[PDB]
Amino acid sequence: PISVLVLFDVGGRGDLSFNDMAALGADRAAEELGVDVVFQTPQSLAVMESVLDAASRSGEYDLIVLVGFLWQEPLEKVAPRYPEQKYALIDAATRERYDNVASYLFREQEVASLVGIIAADIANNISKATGEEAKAGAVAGMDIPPLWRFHIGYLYGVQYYNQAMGTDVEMVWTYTGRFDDPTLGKTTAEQMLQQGVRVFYGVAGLTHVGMFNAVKEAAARGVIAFSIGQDASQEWYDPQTIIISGLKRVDVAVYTAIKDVVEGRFRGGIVSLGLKEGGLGLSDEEIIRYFAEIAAETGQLPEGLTPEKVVEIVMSQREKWISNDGWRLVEELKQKIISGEIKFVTPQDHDTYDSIIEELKAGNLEAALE
Ligand SMILES: Nc1ncnc2c1ncn2[C@@H]1O[C@H](CO)[C@@H](O)[C@H]1O
């Protein structure tokens, strides 16, 4: 039949996040379209190029699916050596343009900005109900382009909220440097708790499962704090504290790239995905229950909890801790974005990214746009 290699960056499955999303798209293609999928996880960064070269060399795969930005460097080198080997790069796009490479990029600014508004609002409500100061936050993985877009969008969204509302909610963003270190994710979060961070956006793959656990042990100590999921809806992991999730439809990327090949309509080039296409979004009722169903039938849903009970609890907390102004502002930005009235800039260098943040920290929001 048709044969696909899914080639992870760092972690592999068990994410609850980025890669498990990617596998889901591949798993759906195996069953619906009848293809053979092989997964594979390099044990080092050093070896990525050799491994990518050997799989192309093998002639066994109609498509090689590359899950993560870190594949961009090795692919730029390998792709031209095997021009009849088809590749899908997920969450990144190659510097040059090849016929044998379909890139799937997301516009993370779009969804993170919506999240920024929400977290600023939840932190505002925490402060208003408690009288103690509550910051927004994020525990991030590696310092790389997609996370630049998250960062920019998240800060944008917080400042937007602040300006539209006369609040001065602060935001603390920490790169941990790894996507596969839950323990480091937890210690990072525990430090942040003691610097007043109370709302925690997870932008670090597996790493921010530790973040989730840090916010649980805080809630257990009586402290009012909340987490925000990314990639999949992760509310099911602990719904009392995981109030919402930014969605990134990596599964649709992978599934679309595999379908295209199955129907001989593959073609090289960039495919950009944001709110307009369904590629990004926020976690709603059905999406929450869907992933909860998955974890239920996976036996990794926590004790004494069903998919239906998970939804009831999240909706309960969104009634309690997200004001209507939060939603009004979400909707007012979501619509300025879809309409084209707003479009973010994709930072070229690290130096450009760094100065967009200086400007957003200064309340100059227009720096992030065109
Ligand atoms: N294994 C990984 N390799 C590269 N990037 C990742 C990985 N896991 C997560 N990410 C990035 O971090 C974000 C937050 O989990 C994801 O949307 C993705 O952009």
Q: Compute the distance from residue 261 Cα to the ligand 1 centre, in Å.
A: 25
| Cβ atoms within 10 Å, residue 364 | 12
Name the DSSP letter for residue 42. -
Q: Compute the distance from residue 68 Cα to the ligand 1 centre, in Å.
A: 7
8 SS3 class:
strand
* Residue at token pair 């109370």: 198
Ramachandran area for residue 17 (φ above 0: left; ψ -120 to 50: alpha; else beta): beta
Experimental method: X-ray
13 SS3 class:
coil
Is 186 a known ligand-binding residue? no
Name the DSSP letter for residue 226. E
Give, in order, the Cα–Cα distances in Å from 249 to each of 34, 162, 165, 303.
21, 29, 31, 28
Q: Whose CA is nearest to atom 4 of ligand 1?
A: 68
**Does residue 48 contact residue 70 with C-beta atoms inside 8 Å?**
yes
Binding pocket residue ranges, ligand 1, CB within 6 Å: 9-11, 17-19, 68-70, 91, 141, 146, 179, 203-205, 230-231, 248
The residue type of 35 is V
Task: Give residue 155's Cα distance to chain centre.
Answer: 15
State the SS3 of 146-205.
HHHHHHHHHHHHHHHHHHCCCCCCCEEEEECCCCCCHHHHHHHHHHHHHCCEEEEEEECC
Alpha-carbon distance of 349 to 145, in angstroms, equals 9
Is 248 a known ligand-binding residue? yes
Alpha-carbon distance of 178 to 187, in angstroms, equals 13
Is 69 a known ligand-binding residue? no
Domain boundaries along the sequence of the chain:
1-106+249-273, 107-248+274-370
Q: What is the topology classification, in CATH, of domain 1-106+249-273? A: Rossmann fold (3.40.50)
